Design a protein around this ligand. Structure first.
Ligand SMILES: O=C(O)C[C@@H]1CCC[C@H]1C(=O)c1ccccc1O
Ligand SMILES: O=C(O)C[C@@H]1CCC[C@H]1C(=O)c1ccccc1O
Lengths: 227, 226
């Protein structure tokens, strides 16, 4: 197959989706075929659609969903509220394996943080990454609290031998402060900081987003993700 | 010895200090002798003194600290700004071991979350808990994202055989709301929820706080801590 990457984060609202669009845009501009999947989408009752947003920002057409729930909560609660079930583990693995192919980068976008339950019983994105032998890209903030959350996440990945593909700061303030500056320097000391997206990148139009995306990542690292 | 409990949380600003004071107060009202150790304090430029909050809210007098940095950052960053080092590992562990005595509940308050660096070099509250054979009480929020952060923290504890003494929700909203109510039920499936402190409790006077605290925790669980 090709390269499967799960895109996770230290928690909710850290920039997972915009980072997914940014890595997809960068990989597209390097000539890499990209597919993005979203095993579980909540918040559809308020218009949440991360796949649609990645298509808008990065131009990705190969977009695959599975489970969708209206309420903007964790999947187990949103499914329960709606009278619906979580998907099974093998259904998520099938969604991913159907997309995987040589020379393609398949990004698997999580819901919330790494240990969020996506399938019964207690099946998380970490288990899925083990199942499809994927590495994990971790989206982080630069805010107070971030190193503890980043270190807990990286420890949880290592516990199941899921490789860490690096960190991406989802929103980077221009200009930064003492805490943001100290955290980025300390984040870079615990793992590779692949990128740091400028604040408000999600508002950029397609052309500015593609320019930001290409500038945001090291063109050489993106190319090395998939032969 | 007695019983040593570290009081950690899933992050910063989750209610660690007010929970420390709530458990101290509940334990004092059950006739238990309570000491609180806060090895490292930051934010002293704006007046942060967590040991003083425990003193006033719960009446604890055995209040032990080692270092105080002016900047409201993590310890390592506040030390870096001040141009001085953090305490040494032995200082923290020996201070706690000296505090511990039979009949006593010694609560150890970290800074920020569980893997925050407290001592030299890169020593955490989790290491401290291993060294003094303490269990860990985990302060959590009810907000969106709390289950992930809770599971992350509890795995990191089990990974070093530090026992989990339960959760406390540092701030329980009124009225709850869908997400907060869903989160409390889910937290209870992860570990015992020992208390959920009413929102605003940090601002109560000492007599109102001791009332809230005595009702917040289960009598038998507190009485059995020592
Ligand atoms: O993916 C995100 O973090 C943003 C989404 C948008 C709607 C609520 C967030 C969500 O899904 C979520 C939040 C906490 C725990 C598990 C979750 O799945
Ligand atoms: O204890 C708290 O979380 C509140 C304090 C008050 C001033 C900054 C907070 C702090 O200490 C802190 C923040 C991030 C990481 C580690 C830390 O130790």
């Amino acid at each position: 197959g090709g390269t499967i990457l799960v895109v996770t984060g230290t928690g909710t609202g850290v920039g997972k989706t915009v980072v997914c669009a940014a890595l997809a845009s960068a990989a597209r501009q390097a000539g890499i075929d990209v597919a993005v999947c979203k095993p579980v989408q909540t918040g559809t009752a308020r218009g949440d659609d991360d796949l649609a947003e990645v298509g808008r920002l990065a131009g990705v057409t190969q977009l695959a969903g599975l489970a969708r729930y209206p309420q903007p909560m964790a999947p187990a609660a949103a499914a329960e509220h709606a009278g619906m079930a979580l998907p099974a583990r093998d259904q998520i693995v099938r969604l991913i394996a159907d997309l995987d192919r040589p020379g393609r980068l398949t990004l698997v976008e999580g819901a919330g943080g790494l240990l969020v339950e996506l399938a019964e019983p207690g099946v998380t994105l970490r288990d899925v990454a083990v199942d499809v032998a994927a590495a994990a890209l971790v989206v982080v903030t630069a805010d107070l609290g971030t190193l503890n959350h980043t270190k807990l996440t990286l420890e949880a990945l290592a516990a199941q031998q899921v490789s860490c593909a690096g960190l991406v700061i989802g929103s980077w303030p221009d200009p930064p402060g003492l805490v943001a500056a100290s955290n980025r320097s300390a984040l870079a000391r615990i793992a590779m900081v692949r990128a740091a997206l400028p604040a408000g990148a999600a508002s950029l139009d397609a052309g500015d987003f593609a320019a930001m995306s290409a500038a945001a990542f090291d063109r050489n690292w993106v190319a090395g993700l998939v032969g």
